[PDB]
Design a protein around this ligand. Structure first.
Ligand SMILES: CCCCCCCC/C=C\CCCCCCCC(=O)OC[C@H](O)CO
Ligand SMILES: CCCCCCCC/C=C\CCCCCCCC(=O)OC[C@H](O)CO
Ligand SMILES: CCCCCCCC/C=C\CCCCCCCC(=O)OC[C@H](O)CO
Ligand SMILES: CCCCCCCC/C=C\CCCCCCCC(=O)OC[C@H](O)CO
Ligand SMILES: CCCCCCCC/C=C\CCCCCCCC(=O)OC[C@H](O)CO
Ligand SMILES: CCCCCCCC/C=C\CCCCCCCC(=O)OC[C@H](O)CO
Ligand SMILES: *C/C=C(C)/C=C/C=C(C)/C=C/C1=C(C)CCCC1(C)C
Ligand SMILES: *C/C=C(C)/C=C/C=C(C)/C=C/C1=C(C)CCCC1(C)C
Ligand SMILES: *C/C=C(C)/C=C/C=C(C)/C=C/C1=C(C)CCCC1(C)C
Ligand SMILES: *C/C=C(C)/C=C/C=C(C)/C=C/C1=C(C)CCCC1(C)C
Ligand SMILES: *C/C=C(C)/C=C/C=C(C)/C=C/C1=C(C)CCCC1(C)C
Ligand SMILES: CCCCCCCCCCCCCCCCCCCC
Ligand SMILES: CCCCCCCCCCCCCCCCCCCC
Ligand SMILES: CCCCCCCCCCCCCCCCCCCC
Ligand SMILES: CCCCCCCCCCCCCCCCCCCC
Ligand SMILES: CCCCCCCCCCCCCCCCCCCC
Ligand SMILES: CCCCCCCCCCCCCCCCCCCC
Ligand SMILES: CCCCCCCCCCCCCCCCCCCC
Ligand SMILES: CCCCCCCCCCCCCCCCCCCC
Ligand SMILES: CCCCCCCCCCCCCCCCCCCC
Ligand SMILES: CCCCCCCCCCCCCCCCCCCC
Ligand SMILES: CCCCCCCCCCCCCCCCCCCC
Ligand SMILES: CCCCCCCCCCCCCCCCCCCC
Ligand SMILES: CCCCCCCCCCCCCCCCCCCC
Ligand SMILES: CCCCCCCCCCCCCCCCCCCC
Ligand SMILES: CCCCCCCCO[C@@H]1O[C@H](CO)[C@@H](O)[C@H](O)[C@H]1O
Ligand SMILES: CCCCCCCCO[C@@H]1O[C@H](CO)[C@@H](O)[C@H](O)[C@H]1O
Ligand SMILES: CCCCCCCCO[C@@H]1O[C@H](CO)[C@@H](O)[C@H](O)[C@H]1O
Ligand SMILES: CCCCCCCCO[C@@H]1O[C@H](CO)[C@@H](O)[C@H](O)[C@H]1O
Ligand SMILES: CCCCCCCCO[C@@H]1O[C@H](CO)[C@@H](O)[C@H](O)[C@H]1O
Ligand code: NA
Ligand code: NA
Ligand code: NA
Ligand code: NA
Ligand code: NA
Lengths: 269, 271, 269, 269, 269
């Protein structure tokens, strides 16, 4: 079957199909994804007034991120269920093209909107020392956009053209390392002038940031992390990828937002 | 028909099918489930300001639990209606695979999110004495996650492999007993220093907790509680399970949340 | 056709079918039903602060009842439109089993949730004199549940077994009369100690309560109220039942809630 | 094809069909309808505290009207798109009975709910002089209900029985003229005692009321306003009717609500 | 086949079809569109109280624009997914007429509602000097309506009749130039008497306004901007148009709204 520039989920769906566990787990984990975002939305709105006026923009940005993210993750979950249909005869779920092909692009577009705001929002809680607010913001916004856009292009080729896949991924990675570099600077400068309690939370924010953000490129590469015809080029790789994306998105948005809010409270007088 | 690692609802649906009463009641009770969660959401938001600032995080946690739970229970209800279709010829509802197989996993994922928050939220109303807040929290969160994850794995095998079903269920039970142990400690320490009215509510919270949480393993086992080819391995067992899950979820979240809110009011200087 | 323990709507749908007027009116009236509930939700939230803090729980309870009532009535409306499909050849709507059979149980489960809260909520506005608060509450909650549960069982048999239908209905009625008895007591005791304006509203609340609550058993019996092969065992009876249920639910929840709120305002100082 | 007591939209759909422009425009205008209602809902909620406490019930009533209006108008829009399907062979949209017949009754039921509230709400902004509040309210509510109910019955016969159509329409019109009479009285009495700025707005409210409310009977009659086999008994008449209903509903609810809010501000210390 | 007066998306869909990238990207970008509107809605509501009472109407107008716009863009995204279905044999998405033809009219009707409010809302933040408030408002509202209505008519003919397409587009352009002229006047008069900070933001508002609003006519013409049988008369032109519309709508509403809110803050005592 000709699928063209399609995600590997479709190729697994079109050949081996998905077992009950593989199909149901992916449906469940993706549903958890958007459910957590809407739960987070309520949390962030309800806790806005827990911090001083000057910190509240960060709480507002956390809630705004939850909107977008809930709608895009909900669309991603519907895309998974509509793309794969039970075959009575073999008792597995196969590609149902009439529901459209499955594409991870809904999730990517959530990143496009939300990355700029997640990077931006910490600048409302911490004070920089050396760096100018507008400079850091502009670096975050440019590199954030380019990281997501180049990755979005790459992932269309993850089966149809491994070279394009890896080149676009590599370019994306460059922008990723730039963001990590700037965010480390922001964390360090944020630490000077604030209580030891505040410094501890910023340490935790950095570890959360580093682990959660590194998951994404892992999920990008997931199908190929065990090489050609590896364990992970399979329904097991599909499950692994969608779990990791869901953990990443929950961690990078909700937990991140909670930690920033807790920092804002400690700095609040 | 090969169904593989599927819930027993599908096997009943695929052989005997469901009577009008069995099918409609399950649809109704599952719908009640998500409707109560959204009603609860409004209640908890609207009553935030009925308690002192320091208690209000518990009300917020109750509302956050209602969100997740409404979406997952709504998805669980849609899964039931889509999976079973009326046959004109025999006048019963049979497995319609085109709607996907029915799986209770939507409900389980609601547990994964919400158990950590339900255990956590009492620590914002009561004061511990001897135990450290961070220690109790960490015990709740680790054991809560492991309980739900191991159960989630088990329930895929509830027909296809009785051994896996019962071993994963047993491991889940171990973590369950750990949580009961810690929650008893938390209740006892919570009772010290507070009015007799407050102590009465905490007693009631503990009974509600113990009964409501014990329903879950009952619902897990439901199809087999009358042995091989028993009364409950049937549409009657399907009805029983989905009723018990719905009662449990309403009790463990909404009533629990209401009792905690009533405790918060008694401990409030406004009262 | 084999329909088993199914509501009489399906039997009419399966034999005579529904005319355009019968089908459209039922769809419209059921839609009005859930629309009024969501309108009520907004009204009750927006008017919370029109009464003293000590009355506001009644306003909150009215809003909570609307949320469950809107969701269940909306589901009941979809059940109607999905269950009956236009036949081009005869120009009438017939049972389409693929949409599931039509059952009034969605409405009944709204009663199960909401009856306990409607009875309870008046105890936050009025003061009892002779009766104990916990006793009245317990009587309301026990009898409310038993009334709706026994009715819910009965209505499955409204065609398949007239005897079961009428026995379960009779048991339901007993619990109904108990509730009427207690509510009369509560109204009377509520009247003592309060302004004549407040007493007048409580008089009106009692008339509304008595008429609105009596409609339900009428709607239960509707198909048979003109005997065997009567005018009402027909699309006209289907229309009559769904109108009466909709009027009852609007009256017993929304108008009831408005009157209680107006009482709360008069008692507000 | 026998359609029975069905709206003329179905007869056009079943014979000539609808062009792309006719079908898409109707879908768009009906969508605009419910979108404006939800936009209005937010406006009215957000502006509640712009007026004195004693005027705020009018703002609340405007918001409550929007909730019913959005749900019913949304249902009316879905009824349109579901009822008419593209035919590849002729490139026109034809009646698809599987989606149900199209009926304007969803809109009518929005009137049933909302007319009583729109008439009522002005009595919270203006003071009567000679007329009794309870008398005006009761006249509005009785005549409002009878106007909508009689029209609702009439419109089922707009093709199948022109006599019934026009008699029910005529009866509806009588109640309409009664409402116009009472509302004129209410406007005049409202003008006494208030600033010239307030009087100007009440003049505008009367013109808006008179034009917007007169559109409805025009839309009722639309298909026949060019006589037998006229220009308007056609997809052009369908477009014209649905445009006029949408303009009327937006004017009579949203603009009306805005003008009343502006009056409330004028009368506010 | 016969598509009649239909958008060029359908003609591409009906002949060449859409590749996975072309179809998925359009679905993603249109989804991003409505997601950003709902994220914006939350931002504007949550920041209302950041400005003086007298500026807050502008913040409220930004939120009201977000409602309409979210619903219309959401409908536009659904229209795209239901209109184009995967063909297993060739592995491309082709016109599925059963989902209705695709039409950009949902977006146009969002313009009809929202243009009048976007133009109006700046008059609540700036003070005019020479020009009269009522005159500017009336010019905006008349020309805004005529611009959108004439464009809406034109776009039906964008394949079926190039002459009608370009004449209606030209008339639309005339009203566009009128609006640009008046808005420049409003910006200039707004700048007189206010802080340098205020003047800077108004300069930025003008550049954003000019670029964002100019994108629309570009998107209108997109399929023909590379002439007969050009690169852009293709799935690439479909992608280009829907990207530009989405960027325009986000820029002209959300960014515009943020800048106006920031202006309101600087002018706030
Ligand atoms: C920041 C802006 C950077 C953009 C610069 C260059 C685009 C690079 C495009 C890379 C696409 C690679 C195509 C490819 O690898 O194709 C080889 C062959 O077709 C496989 O068999
Ligand atoms: C604007 C950026 C759009 C750039 C999209 C073009 C890149 C496509 C690409 O990388 O091509 C892969 C290679 O041709 C194998 O098919
Ligand atoms: C990590 C989750 C991995 C859990 C996998 C355990 C599967 C299992 O229990 O196997 C029994 C089955 O019947 C035969 O494969
Ligand atoms: C638990 C309550 C379940 C009660 C079951 C009701 C059965 C009934 O009343 O009806 C029996 C008869 O067969 C009707 O045709
Ligand atoms: C109140 C219900 C009144 C509804 C009855 C109206 C019937 C009608 O007007 O139709 C008469 C005509 O002779 C037949 O088409
Ligand atoms: C008022 C709106 C009515 C405007 C209708 C204009 C129709 C048009 O422009 O004509 C298309 C051309 O005749 C096709 O060949
Ligand atoms: C809430 C969403 C967030 C924080 C998203 C983060 C996304 C990334 C850090 C993505 C990184 C990627 C690479 C470094 C290479 C491959 C492509 C990406 C976009 C997945
Ligand atoms: C809000 C939902 C709650 C409180 C969920 C509670 C879930 C349990 C206590 C589950 C217990 C289980 C066992 C002890 C064994 C079998 C598997 C489980 C997960 C059902
Ligand atoms: C908002 C919902 C309310 C107040 C529901 C009330 C329901 C009843 C009073 C039902 C009464 C019934 C009987 C007395 C006999 C037949 C069965 C019932 C449940 C319809
Ligand atoms: C918000 C909705 C409003 C204000 C609805 C108004 C409806 C009317 C004034 C209807 C009038 C009619 C007649 C006078 C004759 C024909 C039937 C009606 C109902 C369309
Ligand atoms: C949020 C929506 C906005 C600001 C919409 C703006 C729309 C335009 C400026 C449209 C302009 C057009 C022309 C000048 C010619 C072709 C037709 C139009 C309507 C696209
Ligand atoms: C995975 C759980 C996600 C649930 C939604 C987010 C809820 C936020 C929890 C707040 C915790 C409060 C800690 C403050 C000390
Ligand atoms: C079916 C709809 C699902 C509900 C989604 C819930 C999240 C929406 C966020 C709105 C919550 C508003 C809370 C504001 C309360 C302010 C303080 C308490 C008084
Ligand atoms: C003592 C005051 C407690 C009031 C109880 C109100 C309960 C509201 C919960 C709403 C959830 C739906 C009902 C099951
Ligand atoms: C003035 C008192 C405080 C305002 C409370 C805000 C209420 C937020 C409600 C959240 C959602 C509840 C259910 C939504 C109805 C479903 C809509 C479809
Ligand atoms: C054939 C039965 C074997 C299945 C047993 C699975 C138990 C897994 C438990 C892991 C700990
Ligand atoms: C003081 C009296 C105020 C009465 C307000 C009535 C509003 C009721 C709204 C319920 C929704 C519509 C019901 C038809
Ligand atoms: C200033 C007072 C604030 C009042 C809070 C508003 C309460 C909103 C509750 C939700 C009402 C339902 C609205 C329907 C939304 C439909 C979405 C599609
Ligand atoms: C074939 C006819 C049989 C119909 C008789 C069914 C009647 C059942 C009534 C059961 C009563 C239960 C009492 C419960 C009280 C609480
Ligand atoms: C004080 C001046 C009046 C402000 C007018 C605000 C306009 C309200 C808009 C609400 C509904 C939006 C859709 C209407 C467009 C037709
Ligand atoms: C700062 C003042 C707070 C006032 C609260 C107003 C919020 C009301 C929002 C409810 C209206 C819903 C309209 C959009 C819903 C989107 C659909 C999902
Ligand atoms: C009450 C008025 C009903 C009028 C019906 C007229 C029917 C005419 C039949 C040809
Ligand atoms: C001065 C404060 C600036 C913060 C504004 C950010 C709010 C924007 C919310 C809408 C979603 C953003 C998507 C952009 C791409
Ligand atoms: C400081 C408290 C302010 C309370 C106002 C917050 C209410 C905003 C709700 C508006 C709706 C935004 C989008 C909701 C998404 C839900 C979709 C389901
Ligand atoms: C406003 C005027 C619209 C211009 C319409 C031009 C029609 C051109 C006719 C060409 C032959 C089909
Ligand atoms: C950084 C990780 C780089 C991964 C190296 C690319 C491995 C390419 O392996 C690919 O695996 C597929 C499934 O097994 C095969 O179908 C492809 O033919 C093969 O190219
Ligand atoms: C601790 C709970 C008791 C578990 C007892 C497991 C014995 C169940 O036995 C099972 O019953 C099913 C239904 O009748 C049959 O289909 C299976 O063949 C049979 O293995
Ligand atoms: C208190 C009201 C109870 C009245 C019971 C009357 C018995 C109804 O009689 C039933 O009517 C049906 C249709 O008319 C028939 O099909 C049934 O054969 C018949 O049992
Ligand atoms: C405003 C009152 C106008 C009533 C005039 C009714 C005359 C219309 O007459 C009707 O027109 C239909 C379509 O043209 C025909 O199909 C019908 O046969 C005809 O009865
Ligand atoms: C601003 C641009 C003005 C419009 C340019 C006129 C070009 C019209 O060219 C058109 O291009 C289509 C696709 O190539 C062809 O299918 C049409 O038949 C042709 O009329
Ligand atoms: Na599926
Ligand atoms: Na079903
Ligand atoms: Na139907
Ligand atoms: Na259609
Ligand atoms: Na599609």
């Amino acid at each position: 079957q000709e699928l063209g520039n399609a995600n590997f989920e479709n190729f697994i769906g079109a050949t081996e199909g998905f077992s009950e566990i593989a199909y149901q787990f992916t449906s469940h984990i993706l549903t958890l994804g958007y459910a957590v975002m809407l739960a987070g939305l309520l949390y962030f709105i309800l806790t806005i007034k827990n911090v001083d006026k000057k910190f509240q923009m960060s709480n507002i940005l956390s809630a705004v991120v939850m909107v977008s993210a809930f709608l895009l993750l909900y669309a991603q979950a519907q895309n998974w269920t509509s793309s794969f249909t039970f075959n009575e005869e073999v008792g597995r779920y196969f590609l149902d093209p009439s529901g459209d092909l499955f594409n991870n692009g809904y999730r990517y577009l959530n990143w496009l909107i939300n990355v700029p705001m997640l990077l931006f929002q910490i600048l409302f809680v911490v004070s920089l020392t050396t760096s100018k607010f507008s400079s850091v913001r502009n670096q975050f916004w440019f590199s954030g956009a380019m990281m997501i856009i180049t990755g979005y292009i790459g992932q269309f080729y993850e089966v149809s053209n491994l070279t394009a896949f890896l080149v676009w991924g590599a370019i994306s990675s460059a922008f990723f390392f730039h963001i990590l570099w700037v965010m480390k600077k922001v964390i360090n400068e944020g630490k000077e002038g604030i209580s030891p309690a505040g410094q501890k939370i910023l340490s935790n924010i950095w570890i959360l940031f580093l682990i959660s953000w590194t998951l994404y490129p892992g999920a990008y590469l997931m199908p190929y992390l065990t090489g050609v015809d590896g364990f992970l080029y399979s329904e097991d790789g599909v499950m692994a990828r969608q779990l990791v994306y869901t953990i990443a998105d929950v961690s990078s948005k909700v937990i991140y937002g909670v930690l920033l809010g807790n920092l804002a409270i400690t700095l609040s007088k």
